[PDB]
Design a protein around this ligand. Structure first.
Ligand SMILES: C[C@H](CNC(=O)c1ccc(S(N)(=O)=O)cc1)Cn1ccc2ccccc21
Ligand SMILES: [Hg+2]
Ligand SMILES: [Zn+2]
Length: 258
């Protein structure tokens, strides 16, 4: 009854309602660094988030999303392996119950504490719903989170989590700058894939950053206090909302560095 990350409705059961789960370009995948091909024709990423307008934070039952105003080219991603402009629509995280797990993508089999996904859609398609019907409709920027020192810029997200504890709750979230979540270097790996949660549409160009960001134990602890359940229902902590690495099949992971 509806998908989730539990024993009875987790990733291994998703294929029953979403056949694309066993597709040819499914994500996430394991990044074998010795097998990725350095492609010198890849251009540098162009992240322009100076005019980004955040609006709301919401607990949707499987993660929390910070939504942005995408009615205009306010925050965009260009360059790299991309053709055209992609607008930021929302960002969310995947994390674990323990510090040694939580990321969806892995590097040489290494799992990180969590993973940030900044979701963008190709402006050529007019709206998000149209973009998901195209093989190059989405671009998701993935950033790994390692446990260590606190990340100043993530604290604002951490503070409001108390007001969106259960499924369905949302809170106004204005003036948040997503530039505070970026690592120092923009070196990345790229490959064609899919959304990592149902409907699992194979419409994504994945751009995974080599350099992870550090967050304090206390910061990730707060993510773990959220609920999958709605107000009133029995409590199920929102942890381990990540999908296991999928088969690479006939794809190649290119690297923008050597
Ligand atoms: C998928 C969409 C809501 N889900 C996502 O946007 C989404 C984005 C990124 C990831 S991840 N973790 O890979 O980065 C997972 C889910 C709903 N939706 C489905 C069809 C559809 C059509 C029009 C409007 C909304 C629609
Ligand atoms: Hg698609
Ligand atoms: Zn995600």
């Amino acid at each position: 009854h509806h998908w989730g990350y539990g024993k009875h409705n987790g990733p291994e059961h998703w294929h029953k309602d979403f056949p694309i789960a066993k597709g040819e370009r499914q994500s996430p995948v394991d990044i074998d660094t010795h097998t990725a091909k350095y492609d010198p024709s890849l251009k540098p990423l162009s992240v322009s988030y100076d005019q980004a307008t955040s609006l709301r934070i919401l607990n949707n039952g499987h993660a929390f999303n910070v939504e942005f105003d995408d009615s205009q080219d306010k925050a965009v991603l260009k360059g790299g392996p991309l053709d055209g402009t992609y607008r930021l629509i929302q960002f969310h995280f995947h994390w674990g119950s323990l510090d040694g797990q939580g990321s969806e993508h892995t590097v040489d089999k290494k799992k990180y504490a969590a993973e940030l996904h900044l979701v963008h859609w190709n402006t050529k398609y007019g709206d998000f719903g149209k973009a998901v019907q195209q093989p190059d409709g989405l671009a998701v920027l993935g950033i790994f989170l390692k446990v260590g020192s606190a990340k100043p810029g993530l604290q604002k997200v951490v503070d409001v989590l108390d007001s969106i504890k259960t499924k369905g709750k949302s809170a106004d979230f204005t003036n948040f700058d997503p530039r505070g979540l970026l690592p120092e270097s923009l070196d990345y790996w790229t490959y064609p894939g899919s959304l990592t949660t149902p409907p699992l549409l194979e419409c994504v160009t994945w751009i995974v950053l080599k350099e992870p960001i550090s967050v304090s134990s206390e910061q990730v602890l707060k993510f773990r206090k959220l609920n999958f359940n709605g107000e009133g229902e029995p409590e199920e902590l929102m942890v381990d909302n990540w999908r296991p690495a999928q088969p690479l099949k006939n794809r190649q992971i290119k690297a923008s560095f050597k």
